[PDB]
């Protein structure tokens, strides 16, 4: 019972191994794309209210 559980968990934690490996890139890309849309959401608001004051001046 312990040997079959043993290599069963073994293939199961190989499963978990590459699933965690994939999660690495997963929320890496998540974080950095959040950062991209943040860095462009900023600096576009800046241009916009820039034109705000260009025109009222």
């Amino acid at each position: 019972r312990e040997r079959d559980a043993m290599v069963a968990k073994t293939l199961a934690d190989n499963k978990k191994s590459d699933e965690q490996f994939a999660a690495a890139q997963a929320d890496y890309d998540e974080a950095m794309t959040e950062a991209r849309v943040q860095a462009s959401s900023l600096r576009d608001n800046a241009r916009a209210d820039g034109r705000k004051v260009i025109e009222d001046a």
């Binding site: 040997r3 043993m6 290599v7 968990k9 073994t10 934690d13 190989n14």
Partner: protein
């Protein structure tokens, strides 16, 4: 003692038989079957490693 010397004159050829042929063979096989579970527990160690 004639009957005893004869029967163990036979016993000698019997375990000469076994030490030349069979227990080397089951040594091969049980070595292999020990090697397999040894390797798989090493693999479990490598899996927790990974």
């Amino acid at each position: 003692m004639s009957t005893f010397i004869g029967q163990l004159f036979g016993f000698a050829v019997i375990v000469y038989l076994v030490w030349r042929f069979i227990v080397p063979l089951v040594g091969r096989l049980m070595s292999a079957r020990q090697d397999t579970v040894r390797q798989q527990l090493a693999d479990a160690a490598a899996a927790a490693d990974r």
